[PDB]
Amino acid sequence: RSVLGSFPQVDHHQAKGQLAEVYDDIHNTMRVPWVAFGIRVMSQFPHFIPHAWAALKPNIETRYAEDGADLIRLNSIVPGPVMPNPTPKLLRLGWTESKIEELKTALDLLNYGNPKYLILITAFNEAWHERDTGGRAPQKLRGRDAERIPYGLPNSVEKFNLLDIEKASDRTQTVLRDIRDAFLHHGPASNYRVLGVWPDYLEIALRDSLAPVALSAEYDETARRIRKIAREHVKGFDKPAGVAWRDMTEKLSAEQIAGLTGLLFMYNRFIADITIAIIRLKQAFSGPEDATANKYTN
Amino acid sequence: RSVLGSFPQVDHHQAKGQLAEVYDDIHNTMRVPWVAFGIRVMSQFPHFIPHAWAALKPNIETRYAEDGADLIRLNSIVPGPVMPNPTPKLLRLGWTESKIEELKTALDLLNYGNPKYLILITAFNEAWHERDTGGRAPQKLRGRDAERIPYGLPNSVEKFNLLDIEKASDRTQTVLRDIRDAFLHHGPASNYRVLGVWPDYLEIALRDSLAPVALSAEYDETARRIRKIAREHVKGFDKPAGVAWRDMTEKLSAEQIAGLTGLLFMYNRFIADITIAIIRLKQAFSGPEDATANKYTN
Questions:
Q1: Do the Cβ atoms of A184 and B131 come within 8 Å?
Q2: With CB atoms 3.0 to 4.6 Å apart as the test, which of A156, A182, A221, B254 could cross-link to A8 if both were Cys?
Q3: What are phi and psi of B34, to 5 degrees?
Q4: What is the DSSP letter of B213?
């Protein structure tokens, strides 16, 4: 038996018809090279993802929301131990400059997307429990807060290809398991199914950047802070940015509403954790300013 | 539209036959006068509650597991503002000392049980992800540790009846809904379906005790602290105290394995938040030492 199985989810290859249009819409609207592990997972359920998406789209494409994602990114740094650069270790292991740059680009794209997915999940979750995710403030978004960000991926950014966990080496399987378990999580992030093709780096990543802050006051407090930024930000939305489970009782079964309720709560924690995590990795290379910069939609 | 509606679950009365024996064996093994919300909700899935429960049973029934509960209970105090006593307040509403004493007994019972439930949900959540919940330790439980605590509810302890939410007043509904949303939770705890026969108090409770600490660093750190105690404790079990999703694949569809992964995580947080809440609630009547004692299994 594998150290690590594969979690229940509609894979990117599995998304058919109406659903595969949505995965694209997500890519393009959010200018992100992957669909979130949680979206993939929540998509097995009929109706929900497509409907919640349709009600989130108009709100997440704005410069307003992008400014929110920037607040998340900006404050996602952990008041933690100081970390050594991984660069010398990669060179001595014989990595090319060029290869390391490919890693840092990966990290950079990941750190662009995660915070937007923090906005995303906060919308979906809060709306599910009929709490404030839009159309409540007296003052609508005005001036350029309401402008739309560019559609599609940034020039020279392709969609990621996530590694197939079944086919992967023991080494890769294990480091991912380890990173999952260090944080008490359910699965490997899409983040790590991208970063996993470099198990040797992740092993160093885990020892130098993530294991020493995992489960700590400082780390969870930094999750609390960014979740709060996300939760306050979404009330600025012009119209509600998700569906409410009470409006879904013709669409989902009692069992299903249950499942989705837990799934949403879980992913609202997972995404925050992962956001912090990967920024911290790119902090080990460069520093807190470069690591939390918006490098894509300016 | 109703201000709050009932969350989907196998209500106490609805459990038939084999699941009904399970709800009981829970009641009695844990010496608690209510089956947790999270089990009720989670029971609607085939196989899992009965199965996870069979593995928890011999572990949670030991004196060792009772010490576990006591540690959580002891460490559940928030270092927040000092709260006024509500006793004068309830007297001014004409509550008799006798009625007041009825509320405190109920608070004691909720406070007896929430810590044990945190143990339950920790075992279930961890085992599911094949993380450590028993059997890994060098030598087995010995001495006082291995003994079975008493079976059955304590003397003069009657089973609670949850209040019907649908049927309940607007005021019961408002205050419960306010309590749910103040913590970003999914529904009201069994605890509040008990305490909500008394919405005048819950109202005081929220304004005095709960709302000034909801979502604060101190409240959230307290949760981390107690969740940690619980995660370390189940490691001392003689054998695993739950079931792994990988072993359940004949018994559960992908969709449900996903739904449960979520619910498990969500209740692990939920139960911990509530343990702290209801303790806080008693702490205002009678200080920290009282609020955290084991008054039932000594």
A1: yes
A2: B254
A3: -165, 140
A4: T
Where do the structural domains in chain A lie, given as residue ranges? 1-298
Which residue is closest to B258 within chain A, CA to CA?
A8
Residue of A nearest to B129 (CA): A186
Chain A's closest residue to B265, CA to CA, is: A266
Report the C-alpha gap between B122 and B66 in whole angstroms: 14
User: Rounded to an integer, what distance in angstroms lies between the CA atom of residue B205 and that of residue B19?
Assistant: 35
Q: How far apart are CA A85 and CA A106, in angstroms?
A: 17
Q: What distance in Å separates the CA atoms of residue A278 and residue A195, rounded to the nearest whole number?
A: 10
Query: Which residues in chain A have their CB less than 8 angstroms from residue B259's CB?
Result: 255-256, 258-260, 262-263
Say what angle helices B97-128 and B17-30 make with each other, to 10 degrees. 110
Q: What is the largest CA-CA distance in chain A?
A: 60
Tokens 């010496």 belong to: B31
- Taking each helix axis from N to C terminus, what angle separates A97-128 and A254-285, rounded to the nearest 10 degrees? 150
Which residues does chain B have within 8 Å of residue A254's beta carbon, measured at their own beta carbons? 8, 44
Q: Does B221 touch chain A (CB under 8 A)?
A: yes
Closest listed residue to residue A186, CA positions, set B259, B228, B184, B135: B259
> What token pair was written down for B22?
């399970």
Handedness of CA B32, B36, B42, B44 (dihedral sign): positive
Mutate to test the interface with A, among B261, B267, B271 (most CBs of A within 10 A): B261
Check if B171 contacts A (Cβ < 8 Å). no
Resolution in A for the shown PDB structure?
2.7
- Name residue, tokens 């992908």: B254
d(CA A32, CA A123) in angstroms, rounded, equals 18
Q: Check residue B215 and report its DSSP letter.
A: T
**A258 has a chain B CB within 8 A of its CB:** yes
Closest CA to B223 of B282, B280, B286, B296: B280
Q: Which two tokens stand for residue A64?
A: 């307003």
Mark yes or no for CB contact B262/A257 under 8 Å: no
| Three-state DSSP string of B98-143 | HHHHHHHHHHHHHHHHHHHHHHHHHHHHHHHCCCCCCCCCCCCCCH
Q: Which residues of A touch B265 (CB under 8 A)?
A: 186, 262, 265-266, 269
DSSP string, A79-111: -------SHHHHHHTT--HHHHHHHHHHHHHHH
How far A44 CA sits from the closest chain B CA (Å)?
6
Interface test with A, best of B2, B129, B221, B225 (most A CBs within 10 A): B129
User: For chain A, what's the residue count?
Assistant: 298
* Method used to obtain the model: X-ray
CB B48 within 8 A of CB A259: no
